[model samples]
Target: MEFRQLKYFIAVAEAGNMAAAAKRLHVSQPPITRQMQALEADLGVVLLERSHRGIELTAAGHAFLEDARRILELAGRSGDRSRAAAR
Candidate 1:
């Protein structure tokens, strides 16, 4: 999926739920939930263990979180490198 979705996934994973991620992202809860669902749909995997009490990450979800962090870190580094080269 898109980088935006990856950022959203990172947010949701760290915040422990879509609602908290929404608040952290300064957006509404519904869009966060929808975006997370869309990411899951694109990946063809269930990232969250949804239940009545709270959410939990599946094994795949944990793995993806680390991968996502690595990706974003690289992305940020590349952006910095490009800007430095330009200047």
Candidate 2:
């Protein structure tokens, strides 16, 4: 799984649908779906359940979401620290 894929997954989880998440991320829906599918394949688990109305997170998705958020947050902080040190 890549950071890009995790970002897409988190966006979908928050937006509750691929279209909405894609709009927020300013990317096309298909790519968002593709990345998410790739992440799920990598993990060997079903992360989302899609319905006509929207998508819902699976148990594994919820669990992974927390870790993903932490990872992203730490990455952001690392970047911030690096930039600050450069100054």
Candidate 3:
């Protein structure tokens, strides 16, 4: 829904668990969990499945991850272009 949410999502996805993701992002676990929950609520899909080892991406998450990554990449490019124009 928002860039912040997507960034968090990607971080969690890359880290493969909320705790690790939280550490990498330098935020508390509770807030990261809350943001993930909120993002899931907004999208109406289950993005992650939890287990003893860690979290795994659900079927929906696997599909959604590509789009999330693409969006972030595009946003980065747009920001770069904007900065270049400003210069």
Looking at model 1, residue 54 earns an lDDT score of 54
Screening candidate 1 with a backbone cut-off below 3 angstroms (N, C-alpha, C), the clashing residue pairs are none
Error of 1 at 69 (Å): 0.7
Identify the leading candidate in terms of lDDT: 2
The TM-score of candidate 1 is 0.90
Model 2: per-residue lDDT, tens digit, 17-73? 899999999999899989988999999999999898999999999999999999999
> Which of the two candidates, 1 or 2, achieves a greater lDDT against the reference?
2
Any runs in candidate 3 off by more than 4 Å, and if so which? none
Clashes of each: 0, 0, 0
Per-residue C-alpha lDDT of model 3 across residues 12-65, encoded as one tens digit per residue: 899998899999988898988899899999999999998867789999998988
Off by over 4 Å in 2: none
lDDT head-to-head 1 vs 3, winner: 3
How well does model 2 score by local distance difference test? 0.93
Stretches of candidate 1 off by over 4 Å are none
**Candidate ranking (TM-score, best to worst):** 2, 1, 3
